[PDB]
Amino acid sequence: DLSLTNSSLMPTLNPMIQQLALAIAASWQSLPLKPYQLPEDLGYVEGRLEGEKLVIENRCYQTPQFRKMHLELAKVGKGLDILHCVMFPEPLYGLPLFGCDIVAGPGGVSAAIADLSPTQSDRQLPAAYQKSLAELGQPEFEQQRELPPWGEIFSEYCLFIRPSNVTEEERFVQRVVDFLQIHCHQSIVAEPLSEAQTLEHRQGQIHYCQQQQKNDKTRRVLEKAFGEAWAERYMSQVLFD
Numbered sequence: 001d002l003s004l005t006n007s008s009l010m011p012t013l014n015p016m017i018q019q020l021a022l023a024i025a026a027s028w029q030s031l032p033l034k035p036y037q038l039p040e041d042l043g044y045v046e047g048r049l050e051g052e053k054l055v056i057e058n059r060c061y062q063t064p065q066f067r068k069m070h071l072e073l074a075k076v077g078k079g080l081d082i083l084h085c086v087m088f089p090e091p092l093y094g095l096p097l098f099g100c101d102i103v104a105g106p107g108g109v110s111a112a113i114a115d116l117s118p119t120q121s122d123r124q125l126p127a128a129y130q131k132s133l134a135e136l137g138q139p140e141f142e143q144q145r146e147l148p149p150w151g152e153i154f155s156e157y158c159l160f161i162r163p164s165n166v167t168e169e170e171r172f173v174q175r176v177v178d179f180l181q182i183h184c185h186q187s188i189v190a191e192p193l194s195e196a197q198t199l200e201h202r203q204g205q206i207h208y209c210q211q212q213q214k215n216d217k218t219r220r221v222l223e224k225a226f227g228e229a230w231a232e233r234y235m236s237q238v239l240f241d
C-alpha cells in the first residue's frame, strides 16, 4: 500500500482530519496507485510564520483513471490545522474530480467541505453519479452553505458544513467515505470517451485548477511565510497544476 504511518503531523493534527486522512487512505488503497511526481522540495515543507513553525506533507499518486491524486496535510502555528485532498481525473475517462478540505484550530473544526465536481463542459455529473448521490439520502448538518459566486465550479451535492459537534464530524467523514466508494466504483467501470470529449473534460479540470488557483486562500499564508514567488510555484505546481 501507501500509508500515512510515517507522518510527523498525524499525531498532532485535529482528530477529524486524522479520520479523514485515514478514511481517504483506505479508499485510495483499494485503487491501483502509482507514484506521482511533485517537485522534490515540495513533498515536505517547513517554515516560519509570525514566529511559529509551519509544516506540510504532500502525498501524490496516480492511476490510469486519475491524472493526479493529492493529499495535503499541514500545521501552521499552534492553531491552523489543514487537510486538503483532490483527485484529478484523466480526461479520457470523463470522471468528476473529487475534493475536500478541513480547516481546524484550537476550538475544533471551523470548516469541512467535500464534493464531486463536474468536469463536463455543462457542469453536470454523469447520470450514474446522480443516481447514487441521490440514493444516499439528505445530509443533515447544523452549519452549512455560503459557497461564493465562483462556486460555479462545484456540483450540487457539495457538503460545506461547519461541524456543530463530534457526532457530525463522523457523519461528514462517512459521507466523504460514501462519495469515495461511489467514485472508486465508477472508476473501474469507466470507459474511454471520444477524443472530442477527452478534451472538454481536459477543459473542465483545466478550468477547475485555474479557478481554484485564483481563489484558494492557501496562497496568502504561503506568501507571508515564503513570499509571492514561492506561493505561486506551490499553487500551480502542487495544489491545482
Ligand SMILES: [Cl-]
Residues within 6 Å of the ligand: none
Ligand atoms: Cl484574495
